[PDB]
Design a binder for this molecule. Structure first.
Ligand SMILES: NC(=O)C1=CN([C@@H]2O[C@H](COP(=O)(O)OP(=O)(O)OC[C@H]3O[C@@H](n4cnc5c(N)ncnc54)[C@H](O)[C@@H]3O)[C@@H](O)[C@H]2O)C=CC1
Ligand SMILES: Cc1cc2nc3c(=O)[nH]c(=O)nc-3n(C[C@H](O)[C@H](O)[C@H](O)COP(=O)(O)O)c2cc1C
Ligand code: SF4
Ligand code: FES
Lengths: 150, 512
């Protein structure tokens, strides 16, 4: 993570109304995560306390405080995907990858995350990798798309 | 000299089903055959079982093929694609497909017809006609027009939109805001997503009319982080509208000012609650605010704030362009207008069905949906999202109308419809409702934050077959605690799927 770029990211946004979430997004988008060492920089620029900033980072599931694997694979767990087999897909994904949700494979290639609806509810089970969507995902298609990543 | 226009959708559902690969295969095939095509990346018509849905402009109108995979493209060319030749995947003239033709697409009129980022396409199909009329009215007249239309909040609470705007207009404040709630966190919903990806200018126009109606010069679209495509498309559209004078400090030379920006959410379902949304916009944890102060009076940064759902705002332009009485004539009772219903889940023909209020669930399930994807019988349908009740077949003939659903404990909500077939385990559904509440609780209320997890534990005992009668009673008790001790609908409506599952399918819980 590039500490100097983080300071610039914060400085460019520090007068935006409600700048904290846009700042956290830009740090995560460019560095991969929000490092603990960025919190004092954010806090000072926004005249917020460090605990306040850390509490926001902790509250929102989208934000991560440590790097993910090369690819974040999100498997939808919500109702419409459930109705067409999301539960079995989630069980298979953990067996095929060898790790649970919120975990990263041993080779560091895939981080498996749940997501609660991708707005793909009529063509599930739905999976997102980075920003690439996949519909109608069964065990075969899952293994295929994971193969493509590696 | 001769160029054939081909449409390949760029809606994220079409993209999830391979539309970019189809578009590249069509381009590669045209080049291999020395034929000239213009591949327009339209929104989606919303017939998702046919996506990617390729359309070709012919003398007879646009004809459709679907669903198309990249491997099908050489055969499509061989069968005469560029002339609308018949193929296994042919669907005929697109506007003649009954699923699409038998709709009342007031809000979704352009969706799938246009290039979503083309101002020329937008304005060739009535785009900005509502804004042009609104620029010639006094603010109170715009409020009155939206009032007369009968429009109610399409986020689900169905509060009369014009009354909401009247409050913001009448408030005394130099700074007022328009806030679009694009958090669309409910499973089974994608109508907001489709507006933002497939007809973004309509949302921009609707928010600009709202700004004119109440005296706001700044707007914010709060879009969930799960929708990266919507966010990218809205940002491009805002840039394009600004460059052409539809936004900024001198909109179309009127001297009216409106600036708009997109804010990305961060994975919290509860930020669809309007005050938790405001907290997030202001950079804080998404904790629901006590609501003796209405956001319409003290909202974003304590200023008078219009907060409306994407569909609510996106319906404002047609209300202005065609008039309140035209809009009000659709529907039934107090449910005036149309709603983009969303058919989702275990559904054979899922997608977007905009219809006047009063259509029944059975009509949508059978006449449009074609039954389940699996072919098994429908067993339970959750309407209105994860906080809606499960409906059994005995309720499928209630008209989809806010008051008629409320009367029996149904929730129209945003109009999303999630179909479960006979394999569904309603005890596992009840457990999930509790798990989801435990995951998403903002934490302010004890029954929501901790009671939900105890409900999971008890449901686990029920699913393992341990003392079903005792533990169902405990769940019932916990539900009453949530009904009476929740400060917003996350905790307060979690009992709706739980109690409807338990009441309608007690056999799944081990009971008689
Ligand atoms: O879930 P909720 O959205 O909490 O559903 P709710 O039923 O409390 O009200 C829903 C919508 O109507 C607004 N509202 C209610 N009374 C109003 C008034 N007199 N003037 C202006 N806006 C008003 C709320 O702020 C919210 O946007
Ligand atoms: C848990 C919870 C989630 C909600 N999610 C949404 C949403 O995703 N989109 C929306 O428009 N309203 C949502 N609401 C309703 C908003 O609080 C509020 O009704 C909003 O102002 C709707 O504007 P409208 O009048 O145009 O419907 C949610 C409420 C709760 C309690
Ligand atoms: S009911 Fe739940 S989400 Fe709503 S205010 Fe209480 S703790 Fe927060
Ligand atoms: S429930 Fe999975 S994409 Fe909506």
């Amino acid at each position: 993570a590039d500490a100097t770029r983080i300071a610039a990211i914060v400085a460019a946004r520090q007068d935006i109304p409600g700048a904290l979430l846009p700042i956290l997004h830009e740090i995560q988008d460019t560095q991969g995560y929000i490092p603990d060492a960025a919190v004092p920089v954010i806090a000072r620029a926004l005249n917020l306390s460090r605990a306040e900033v850390h509490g926001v980072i902790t509250f929102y599931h989208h934000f991560r405080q440590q790097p993910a694997g090369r690819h974040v694979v999100q498997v939808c767990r919500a109702e419409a995907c459930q109705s067409v087999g999301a539960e079995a897909l989630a069980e298979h994904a953990q067996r095929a990858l060898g790790c649970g949700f919120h975990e990263t494979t041993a080779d560091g290639q895939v981080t498996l995350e749940p997501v609660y609806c991708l707005g793909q509810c009529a063509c599930g089970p739905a999976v997102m990798v980075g920003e690439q969507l996949h519909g109608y995902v069964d065990a075969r298609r899952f293994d295929a798309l994971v193969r493509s990543l590696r | 000299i001769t160029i054939t226009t081909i449409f390949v959708p760029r809606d994220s559902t079409a993209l999830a089903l391979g539309a970019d690969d189809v578009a590249r295969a069509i381009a590669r095939e045209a080049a291999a055959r020395n034929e000239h095509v213009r591949i327009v990346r339209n929104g989606s018509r919303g017939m998702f079982w046919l996506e990617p849905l390729v359309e070709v402009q012919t003398g007879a109108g646009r004809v459709a093929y679907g669903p198309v995979s990249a491997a099908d493209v050489p055969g499509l060319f061989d069968a005469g694609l560029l002339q609308g030749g018949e193929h296994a995947l042919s669907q005929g003239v697109t506007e003649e497909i009954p699923f699409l033709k038998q709709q009342e697409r007031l809000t979704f009129a352009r969706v799938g017809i246009t290039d979503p980022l083309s101002l020329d396409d937008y304005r060739a199909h009535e785009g900005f006609a509502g804004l042009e009329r609104a620029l010639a009215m006094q603010p109170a007249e715009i409020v009155q027009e939206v009032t007369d239309s009968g429009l109610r909040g399409r986020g689900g609470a169905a509060f009369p939109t014009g009354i909401k705007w009247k409050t913001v207009l009448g408030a005394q404040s130099a700074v007022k805001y328009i806030v679009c709630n694009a958090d669309e966190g409910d499973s089974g919903t994608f109508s907001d997503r489709m507006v933002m990806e497939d007809d973004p200018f309509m949302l921009i126009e609707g928010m600009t009319i709202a700004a004119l109606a109440v005296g706001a010069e700044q707007g914010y679209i709060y879009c969930r982080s799960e929708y990266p495509h919507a966010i990218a498309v809205l940002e491009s559209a805002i840039g394009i509208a600004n460059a052409a004078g539809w936004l900024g400090d001198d909109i179309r030379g009127s001297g009216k000012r409106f600036h708009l920006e997109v804010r990305k959410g961060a994975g919290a379902y509860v930020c669809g609650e309007e005050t938790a949304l405001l907290e997030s916009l202001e950079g804080r944890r998404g904790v629901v605010r006590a609501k003796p102060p209405l956001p319409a009076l003290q909202g974003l940064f304590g200023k008078p704030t219009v907060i409306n759902n994407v569909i609510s705002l996106a319906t404002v332009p047609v209300i202005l362009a065609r008039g309140a009485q035209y809009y009000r004539d659709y529907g039934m009772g107090r449910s005036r207008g149309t709603l983009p219903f969303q058919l989702a889940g275990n559904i054979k023909q899922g997608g977007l069905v905009e219809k006047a209020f009063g259509v029944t669930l059975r009509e949508l399930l059978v006449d449009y949906g074609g039954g389940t994807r699996s072919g098994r019988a429908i067993r339970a349908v959750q309407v209105g999202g994860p906080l809606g009740a499960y409906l059994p077949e005995s309720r499928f003939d209630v008209p989809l109308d806010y008051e008629a659903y409320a009367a029996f404990g149904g929730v129209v909500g945003h109009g999303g419809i999630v179909v479960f077939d006979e394999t569904v385990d309603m005890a596992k559904q009840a457990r999930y409702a509790m798990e989801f509440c435990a995951i998403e609780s903002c934490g302010k209320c004890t029954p929501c934050r901790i009671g939900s997890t105890r409900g999971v534990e008890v449901m686990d005992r029920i699913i393992a077959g341990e003392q079903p009668v005792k533990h169902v009673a405990l769940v019932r008790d916990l539900c009453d605690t949530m009904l009476n001790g929740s400060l917003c609908a996350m905790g307060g409506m979690t009992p709706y799927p739980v109690l409807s599952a338990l009441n309608e399918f007690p056999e799944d819980f081990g009971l008689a």
